[PDB]
Design a binder for these strands. Sequence first.
DNA 1: CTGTATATAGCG
DNA 2: TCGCTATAATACA
Length: 204
Amino acid sequence: HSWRHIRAEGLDSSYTVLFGKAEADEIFQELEKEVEYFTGALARVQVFGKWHSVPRKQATYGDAGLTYTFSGLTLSPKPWIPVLERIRDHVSGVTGQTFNFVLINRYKDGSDHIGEHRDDCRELAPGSPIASVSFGASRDFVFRHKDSRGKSPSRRVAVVRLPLAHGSLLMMNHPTNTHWYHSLPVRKKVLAPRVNLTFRKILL
DNA sequence: CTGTATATAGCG
DNA sequence: TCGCTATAATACA
């Protein structure tokens, strides 16, 4: 109900805290108990011609039949579990949006990270918002405009930086993900784990 | 003078 | 400790 609006050219997101500390703690504990992360061949991706194990853990849950593909890796969704349905439904209630899929990224500490990218799958329903819900350690989240990259950038739109707190929701609305890359950079001083859930509308 | 795109290495 | 550019080899359009 009270949102910090994050706006810039082609950037339209909003940030709010959904859950107090006690409730966020319970949910975090239950996520740590219940979520099953991919391992092995389902945790390696191909970027710039080389394969790497991802510097974090990932899981996908959602409706049957959906798939999620990026960087040479295809993930199939595990059936929904109660903790994930409760979060999905709370976010849906607060936003008026619906989601049929969630990507979970877990960062064991500040050395786990995710590189710059846009969430612009073919399988992502056109114009649908992405709901990013975070539990555990606060981590810095960075938005960067496509045109501001690489030595002599075309222009210089300033980076937008947000800490995402325990129990928070970041809604990324169209067309944020057509124009802006995001990442979760390494933060060596962070010692504790963070679990991020990104709820999405995926096309069958 | 001139295609576009994408995890760590190797700097500074 | 952080953040910059270049780019593991292709795959396009």
